[PDB]
């Protein structure tokens, strides 16, 4: 039997780990940028560091449903970026948390030491997000969020894992010469990731 990247157990485990990381990061971003009230969040522990978990079931299901669709792309190494876009009540993007991701074309079949230093890497990103409010201006009241996914290069509507996706428009993904705030860029044998924020200027 001939295997493709997605058939590798290691590719599936990494996809699981990264999808969970994105879930933790999305919850944290919503908390620190106050997209949802502090009242719905509860402090929990992840990667041995404090994080904030939404306790609103509907929001939690929405985030899981969304990220569950990114998992297969991660296994196939077809995801370039996952972006959390915060928009004001006028539907204008005010902040964009950009997670650029690159993965090797293959992973070892010798699964040993796969996630060796992964937690230290993910922890670094969470810590940066945790204090991002110190380098960003306060967002206006009534903001909402959307998640954008950029894939590796025909239907306008795509249904993945029973969840519908559509092409985003420059009407909600355009910022004229925005301020770029680097947060963290790290590399490892299984992943290279770069997180930065684009802020409306």
């Amino acid at each position: 039997t001939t295997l493709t990247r997605q058939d590798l157990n290691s590719a599936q485990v990494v996809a699981d780990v990264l999808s969970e990381f994105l879930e933790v990061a999305v919850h944290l971003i919503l908390y620190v940028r106050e997209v949802y009230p502090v009242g719905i969040f509860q402090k929990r522990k992840k990667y041995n560091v404090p994080v904030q978990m939404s306790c609103h079931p509907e929001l939690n299901q929405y985030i899981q449903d969304t990220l569950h669709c990114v998992k297969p792309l991660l296994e196939k190494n077809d995801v370039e970026k996952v972006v959390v876009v915060i928009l004001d009540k006028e539907h204008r993007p005010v902040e964009k948390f950009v997670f650029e991701i690159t993965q090797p074309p293959l992973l070892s079949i010798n699964s040993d030491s796969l996630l060796s230093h992964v937690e230290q890497l993910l922890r670094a990103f969470i810590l940066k997000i945790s204090k991002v409010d110190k380098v960003l201006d306060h967002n206006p009241p009534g903001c909402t969020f959307t998640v954008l996914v950029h894939t590796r290069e025909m239907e306008k509507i795509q249904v993945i894992k029973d969840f519908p996706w559509i092409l985003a428009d420059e009407q909600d993904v355009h910022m004229h010469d925005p301020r770029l705030i680097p947060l963290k860029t790290m590399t490892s044998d299984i992943l290279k990731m770069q997180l930065y924020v684009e802020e409306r200027a």
Binding site: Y62, T66, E80, K81, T144, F145, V147, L148, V149, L167
Partner: peptide
């Protein structure tokens, strides 16, 4: 790159939003 792609379903508001299919 392909996309960007976004969920057709908008993020839920604190309390369910209004009826507007289109």
């Amino acid at each position: 790159s392909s996309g960007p792609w976004k969920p057709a379903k908008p993020a839920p508001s604190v309390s369910p939003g209004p009826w507007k299919p289109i």
